[PDB]
């Protein structure tokens, strides 16, 4: 996260770290959506152009974390993966369309002060909140700048950007399964997700019921925090039918 700040303790209790076993390293962010399901970006697991193709046994999920590198004894819980599900129409060849994957844990994780699931949006909450100017929140342990790495989880609040501005900022073909967020050059404020924040949540707090909803997944961007560029996020609600289908048949 570039131009963010240290998260407060328990600020993002759905935050998940995807952790590579060997070598031991951060692979991506992710989010907890139930006691046995974790949501992330497909590109965290599968990206053939960079020879990335992770299997279940390659990975661990670490939940309840704050410190990036420490083993947070008595606080974090580490889970093994039973199975990975990548969207069958994930477009890694072109523009990361449908950049979404689910991971089923071998065992349910116990909720605590530091571990708690985020809500997925309904059509109505999505329609109400996914509007240009409305701010969401992105969290992660990724790079502090494009070209170092934070001691603890970082947080930044960023405004959703009008679709035409998103489109006009890039040569990449944008789809309805993506939205973009960040400040415009004229707006002065800045901030962005970056490498390593991949797969983490873009959340909004509903003013109707005071619950946090995951509207987006950190997907892609051209560099990090560049003037005139925006961060792109998987549109979770647009892909919710797939999410429910996977959980309904395998959960």
């Amino acid at each position: 996260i570039v131009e963010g700040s240290d998260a407060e303790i328990g600020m993002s209790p759905w935050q998940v770290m995807l952790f590579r076993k060997s070598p031991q390293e951060l692979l991506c962010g992710a989010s907890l959506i139930s006691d046995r399901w974790v949501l992330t970006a497909a590109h965290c697991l599968l990206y053939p152009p960079w020879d990335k193709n992770f299997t279940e046994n390659d990975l661990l999920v670490r939940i309840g974390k704050h410190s990036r590198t420490r083993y947070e004894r008595n606080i974090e819980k580490i889970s093994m993966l039973e199975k990975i599900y990548i969207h069958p129409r994930y477009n890694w060849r072109e523009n990361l369309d449908r950049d979404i994957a689910l991971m089923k844990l071998k065992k349910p994780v116990a909720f605590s002060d530091y571990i708690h699931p985020v809500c997925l949006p309904d059509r109505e909450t999505a329609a109400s909140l996914l509007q240009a100017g409305y701010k969401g929140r992105v969290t992660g342990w990724g790079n502090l700048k494009e070209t170092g790495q934070p001691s603890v989880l970082q947080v930044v609040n960023l405004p959703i950007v009008e679709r035409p501005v998103c489109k006009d900022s890039t040569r990449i073909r944008i789809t309805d399964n993506m939205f973009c967020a960040g400040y415009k050059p004229d707006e002065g404020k800045r901030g962005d997700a970056c490498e390593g924040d991949s797969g983490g949540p873009f959340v909004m707090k509903s003013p109707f019921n005071n619950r946090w909803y995951q509207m987006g997944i950190v997907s892609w961007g051209e560099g990090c925090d560049r003037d005139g560029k925006y961060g792109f996020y998987t549109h979770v609600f647009r892909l919710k039918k797939w999410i429910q289908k996977v959980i309904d048949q395998f959960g």
Partner: peptide, 11 residues
Amino acid sequence: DFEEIPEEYLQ
């Protein structure tokens, strides 16, 4: 850079 995790999770 990362602190080692309990072996039980790598077994």
